[PDB]
Amino acid sequence: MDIQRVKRLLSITNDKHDEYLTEMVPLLVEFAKDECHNPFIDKDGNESIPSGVLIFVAKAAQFYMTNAGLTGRSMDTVSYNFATEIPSTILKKLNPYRKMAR
Amino acid sequence: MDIQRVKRLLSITNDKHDEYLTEMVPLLVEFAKDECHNPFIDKDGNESIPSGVLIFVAKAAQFYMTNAGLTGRSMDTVSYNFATEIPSTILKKLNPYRKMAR
Amino acid sequence: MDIQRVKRLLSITNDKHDEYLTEMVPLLVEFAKDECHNPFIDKDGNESIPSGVLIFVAKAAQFYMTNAGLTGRSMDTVSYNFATEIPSTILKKLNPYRKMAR
Amino acid sequence: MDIQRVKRLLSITNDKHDEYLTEMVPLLVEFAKDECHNPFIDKDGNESIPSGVLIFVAKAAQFYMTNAGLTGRSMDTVSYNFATEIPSTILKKLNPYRKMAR
Amino acid sequence: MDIQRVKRLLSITNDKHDEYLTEMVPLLVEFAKDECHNPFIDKDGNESIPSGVLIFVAKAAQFYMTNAGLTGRSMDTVSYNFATEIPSTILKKLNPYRKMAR
Amino acid sequence: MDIQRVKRLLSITNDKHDEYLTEMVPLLVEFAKDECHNPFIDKDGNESIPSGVLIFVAKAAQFYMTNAGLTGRSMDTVSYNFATEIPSTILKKLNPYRKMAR
Amino acid sequence: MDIQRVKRLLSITNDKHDEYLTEMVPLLVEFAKDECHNPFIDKDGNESIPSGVLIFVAKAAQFYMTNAGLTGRSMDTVSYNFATEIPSTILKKLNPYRKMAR
Amino acid sequence: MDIQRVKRLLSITNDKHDEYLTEMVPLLVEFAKDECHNPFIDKDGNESIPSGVLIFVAKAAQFYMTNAGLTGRSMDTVSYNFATEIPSTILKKLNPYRKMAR
Amino acid sequence: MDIQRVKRLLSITNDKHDEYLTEMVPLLVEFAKDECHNPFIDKDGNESIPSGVLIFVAKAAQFYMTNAGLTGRSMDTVSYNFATEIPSTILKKLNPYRKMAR
Amino acid sequence: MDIQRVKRLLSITNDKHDEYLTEMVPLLVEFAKDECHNPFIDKDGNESIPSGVLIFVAKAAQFYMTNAGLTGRSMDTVSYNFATEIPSTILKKLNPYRKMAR
Amino acid sequence: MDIQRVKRLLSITNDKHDEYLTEMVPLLVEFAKDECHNPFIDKDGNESIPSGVLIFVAKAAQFYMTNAGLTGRSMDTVSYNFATEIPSTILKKLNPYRKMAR
Amino acid sequence: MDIQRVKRLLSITNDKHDEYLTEMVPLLVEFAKDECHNPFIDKDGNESIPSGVLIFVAKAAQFYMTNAGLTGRSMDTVSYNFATEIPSTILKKLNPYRKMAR
Amino acid sequence: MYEEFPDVITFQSYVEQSNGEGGKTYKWVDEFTAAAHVQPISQEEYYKAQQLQTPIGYNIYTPYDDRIDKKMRVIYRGKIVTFIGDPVDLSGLQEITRIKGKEDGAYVG
Amino acid sequence: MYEEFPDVITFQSYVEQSNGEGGKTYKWVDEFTAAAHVQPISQEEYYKAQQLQTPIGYNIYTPYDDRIDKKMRVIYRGKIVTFIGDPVDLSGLQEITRIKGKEDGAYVG
Amino acid sequence: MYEEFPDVITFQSYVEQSNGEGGKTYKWVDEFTAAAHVQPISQEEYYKAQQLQTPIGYNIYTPYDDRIDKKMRVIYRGKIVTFIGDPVDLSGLQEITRIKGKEDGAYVG
Amino acid sequence: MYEEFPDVITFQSYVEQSNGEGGKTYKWVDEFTAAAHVQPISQEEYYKAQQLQTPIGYNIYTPYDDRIDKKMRVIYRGKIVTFIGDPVDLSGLQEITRIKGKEDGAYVG
Amino acid sequence: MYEEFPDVITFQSYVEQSNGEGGKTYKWVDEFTAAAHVQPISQEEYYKAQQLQTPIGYNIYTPYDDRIDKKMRVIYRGKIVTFIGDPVDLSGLQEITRIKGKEDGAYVG
Amino acid sequence: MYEEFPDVITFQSYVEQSNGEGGKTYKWVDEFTAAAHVQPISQEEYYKAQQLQTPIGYNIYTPYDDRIDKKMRVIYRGKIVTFIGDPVDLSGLQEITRIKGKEDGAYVG
């Protein structure tokens, strides 16, 4: 997956996240391949990633920018409440491509 | 799906969201096709997207403008509470077109 | 469905919502036809939309003016709490006209 | 149903709600006829609306003056909490006239 | 049912509610007759309304003075919380006179 | 039931509630007679109301002085929270005299 | 039951409650007799009220000094929260003397 | 049970509660005798109250100093929350002496 | 059980509780004997109280210093919240010595 | 168990708790012996206390420094919330040594 | 796993966490190997850690930077709420490689 | 287990905890050995502690620095909320090495 | 019962009589009566009202009426109540009027 | 027990005696006694009361009684309590009277 | 219905007329009309507003409009409302404008 | 352990010695000792205490004792604590006494 | 989208130009631009800011930047914003900077 | 990690050097260093601190140490921090010390 395409899908304009995305996006692609037991290879032997895997990879890369051991944070006038799990509607994007392990 | 028609369905007048929508709308169309196992093709072989799929694509593109790792935010006069899942009344915009996988 | 009739049913007097309603109302009519599996055609071959479909279309068009990824908002002295799902009493207007898919 | 009789049942004295009521009341009468599967006709073929249907039509017309996508609102001294469903004691104003569909 | 008797039962002294009560009380009498399937007619063919029906009609007429789409309201220093349903102890006044529909 | 005896049971000294009690007490006596299916008559045919019916009539007349559509109220220093149902310990005052309907 | 004995059991020193207690205490004695189906009569034909009935009568007379339709009250700096039902530990004082109705 | 021994068990030094305790303690002793169906009599026919009954009588006399119709109270600097039932660990102070009724 | 040993186990240094402890501790020893159905007598006929009974007696004597009819109290700047029952971990100290009643 | 070793396990440097610990630690050792039905004796008849009995004795002695009748306390800048039961992860330290009673 | 790759996956730029990560990362690699019962070895006998184990090791090392005995903290403008368990979506990263123990 | 290795795993730099860790760490090693029924001895008879036991010992030693009878504490501007139990994700580190008792 | 307005107050105006040669006599005469709730100010409002040139004693709540004027007077429980400032309609919704006032001695009549 | 009013206070008035030639002697004599609760003001109310010309020391809560006047005095625990301002009936409901006061030395009697 | 803006107000400017010889006459003429909500200030805000040289009487909430100027005037219910300070756009989001104002007598017209 | 009163303080009075020719020497001598909790004032109470002529430094909580007088002194941790105002018994219930005070340098002794 | 910082502001410094004979001309020139959120102060903060010699109009929130100085200026929506006091880094964590400021008329440029 | 004390500060005393003929030179020399958290005051505390003769800029939280004196100084991030008032031990429990201070320009060294 192209890094600039993920930045367009998450509406990021600066380059503050480029070092993180360059590491995180190929790992999430390989995890979609291992979790679905599906190499995503078309008729002609070529890798062809479906659209739902792309939505899943972009949204999971956005989710994993948080801190893992933190639920809420407050700093004078600003405050944040964080999600603890990946939501089920993002995890259900991988559902139409699931095969069984052999 | 036409981008200007999506902007009319979501009451958007400026061009602030154009680069996100140009990337996100065709991915959601292909996800509806893969999730219903339905290519949405009429008698003459032409692609005819139903109205309920169009409502779903517009509302899901509006939902995915949020940050995935955040449930709440506050800055000094403003505060926001975000929805964590797509509501079931939007997910039920795919139901009358569902086929089984072959 | 006529747009001015919907504006009378929702107590709208200005023209701030006309571009949205002109897009949204025919899509909701076609979705009621697909959801009930009913073309709403009388003896003489003419389209005759029943009253409950009209109530459903007006109230669903009013509901979909909200933002899909937001449950609450605050701005200095004003605040809003939003509904997450379409209520069951609006969805139950389509119940007396439901047929089975063939 | 006469509009002035509905205004007497809801304690309305001015003419602020007249254009909404003129559109909404006959639609609710036809919805009661379709939902009970009962045309409300006496011995001589004359239309005779029962009292409980009239109470239901007036209270449902008062209920649908709210905004469908809003559960609460506040402006600086005023605040409002809205009901999201029609109460079951108003929905039970149709029960002694219910017939089966043919 | 006499209107002045209902006003004595609800502790009303002025004439602010007379136009509402003159409309609402006969409709509630006919609804009690339809809900119990009982014409309330004694030995000599005369209409004889029992005491529990009178308590039910007075308390339901007091309940229906509220606004149907509102659960709470605040205005500077004053506030109100409203009941959403008719309580079961008022609805159970009609229980000793219930017959079956023929 | 004597009205002054009810005023002694409820610790009322003035005459502010006299017109309400004169209307409400005999209706509650007839409701207890109809609800227990018991005319409360001794050996000589004389009406002998038991002590339980007297306690129940007094407490139910005190309960029905509230507004039926209100659960809470507040004005600037004063506030009230109201009970929505008659408590079961007052309703269990009628239990030792219950007969079956014939 | 003696009224001064009840006043000693409830720690009342003035005479503000004497008119209420003189009415309420014999009614509660007769209700204990009707609820237990027990006349409380010893070997020699004499009325002999047991100790648990006396505790029950004193505590129920203290409970019924409240207002029946009120759960909470506030008045500037003072506030009160009231019990809605008689507690089960007071009602269970009548348990060792219960007989069956004949 | 001796009143001064009860005052030593409840850490009472003054004589403010003497008139209440002189009335309440023998009633609780007779209630324990009737509730366990046990007259508490040794070999020589002498009354021998067990230690657990004594703990129960003292703690129940301390519990019944509250107002039965009140769960909370507040005056400007002081506030109180009251227990509504006797706790089960005090009610279990009768269990090893329980016999069946004959 | 020695009173000074209990005072060392509860970290009491003054003599404000001595009159209470001198009364309460032997009653709790005899109640542990009646509750376990165990006289705690060794080989040589001598009373030998086990360690868990000693922990139970000290902690129950500390628990019973509270007021039985109070769960919370506030006084200007100080406040207290009280336990309603003896905790299960203190009651489970008597478990390894339980015999059956004969 | 040595008292200084318990003070090293609980991070205590002064001698404020010495008189309580000197009384409480051997009682908890005998309670572990009685509750596991295990005298903790090696091959040569020597007493060998396992590591988990030591951890349990230290943490239970730290737990029992609280007041048994108190769940919370507050004085003007300080406040405390206390645990009411020993946690199950401390009680599960005795589990690998449990034998049956003979 | 390389420490600089973990620092790129967690968006860490300084060297404040280097001594903790150098100790914690190889322990988590061996824990994944023991917990999946999988040594992660390819055809040629070379160690090939999958992408899932890498994501899991990085997120678990970020989780274990918190204090284990603390759920919340606050100092005067700053406040924190901590997560008490590792989320199940991080634990499900090890699922596609699980083997049974032999 | 080495004490300086545990201090590197918990990010401790000073020597304020050294007297506690020197006592607590060998006891937790012996508890892991007795709870898993596993001496952790390799082929050559040498003690070889696995990685998950090391993670468990470090995190349990960090957890047991809290006070056992305290769930929350406040001191002017600072406040703390404490965990009551060891979390299940720390206790599940011992799971891949569990044997049965012989 | 639990009435929002348990009191009865009297509104008075300051009007002119002229009879016979030339006359300047003005009399407080009654205008109308209404149901109301007269409340003393709260314990926290007392310290705020003490820092004013005319301290406030009472808040009067009444149903909305456009006859109520800022130059009027209230008779309540045999006492004269003098208005402080302008009457306020709560949130502009024309339901409840609040008036601030102070006690001004006994009334004869 | 837990009484709302655990204290006993004495109300005193300033009345005239005249005997024999012409006399001006006024004496504080007792009027009646009542159950009450005498509370010191809170820690927050102290800083608000320090910005007054006569600072307040005590709040006295008593059941409602129309004999209580603003020129009266209270004897409580051997001390004289002097009224500050007018007595207040809470929310106009005629149930509980609150009086503000300050200590004025010991009482002889 | 429950409208956020149930009132109708008129905005007025102070503009010049000149005709014939030399003229200085300035007239308040209407600019536009808008839906609004005119609220009196709350009971707690009253004591804060009394410590100002120009005390505030009303808060006016209206939808956002960049034609609104601080030298303008409002006609509302036959009364003149004069602005106090600068108009405020809430949180900088350009949705709702709040104006503070005070009543300035009756309007003729 | 978690004691409400973890400190120990000393109460001192200002008493006269006279020996031999005529003497005016007054000495601070000890009266008694008690368990207490000495707390500095909170962060919000600091700004309220800065607007006083004698600013407050400490709140002292002790069990109720009628020997405590407003002219006394406290020795605590080698420092002198001087009373500000009168001792307060909390809510009139005679359980806990609160004293306000300020530090006044080191103590010799 | 819902951005924390939806505005764009310009930071300006007051720097010297000197050319040819001797020159004293100082010009406000741009330093850099940043994403920000410019908020008017709340309704409660208004009454607190009115008791200052320079009243505050705006709070500006921006990401942390050590180039921001207290002698700088902000251009925002064609208006000049002048700093009041020193810039504040929130809680010392070096994430978000808050600046207080006031409007100073229109900008030409 | 999430440290309570993420900063490092330096404490300094004002001590005397004397060498050779007679000397009065006093130098600020370092005493010790400690872990701390230096926080600017909150938005609500700013308006309270503006009504003082020496306004407060920072709250410094540090672990408890009896070497800290009110005549000391703090070096933090190349800036001098001057103490305002006396150091406070929170609730008298001897765990955390809070110091109030203000910035006093740059440090050389």
Author numbering:
A (entry chain c), B (entry chain d), C (entry chain e), D (entry chain f), E (entry chain g), F (entry chain h), ...: 1 to 102
M (entry chain 4), N (entry chain 5), O (entry chain 3), P (entry chain 6), Q (entry chain 2), R (entry chain 1): 1 to 109
Original authors' sentences:
Here we report a cryoEM structure of the 902 kDa bacteriophage SPP1 connector in the post-DNA packaging state at a resolution of 2.7 Å. We have found that the connector comprises 12 subunits of both gp6 and gp15, but only 6 copies of gp16 in contrast to previous reports. Gp6 encompasses four major domains: the crown, wing, stem, and clip. In the connector gp6, Pro296 is shifted upwards by 7 Å bringing helix α4 to a more horizontal orientation closer to the gp6 β-hairpin of subunit i + 2. These changes in the clip domains of the connector gp6 lead to formation of pockets where the C-termini of gp15 bind to the portal oligomer. Gp15 interacts with the gp6 oligomer mostly via insertion of its C-terminus into the gp6 clip pocket. The most dramatic conformational change takes place by folding of loop α2-α3 into the β1-β2 hairpin that forms the gp15 24-stranded intermolecular β-barrel. Each gp16 subunit makes contacts with four gp15 subunits. This network of interactions establishes the transition of 12 to 6-fold symmetry within the connector.
Many double-stranded DNA (dsDNA) viruses have a specialized portal complex at one 5-fold vertex of their icosahedral capsid through which dsDNA enters and exits the virion. Sealing of the portal channel is achieved by binding head completion proteins to assemble a complex named connector in tailed prokaryotic viruses, which consists of stacked cyclical oligomers creating a channel for DNA traffic. In bacteriophage SPP1, the gp15 and gp16 head completion proteins bind sequentially to the dodecameric portal protein gp6 after DNA packaging. The gp15 adaptor protein extends the portal tunnel that is fastened afterwards by binding the gp16 stopper protein.
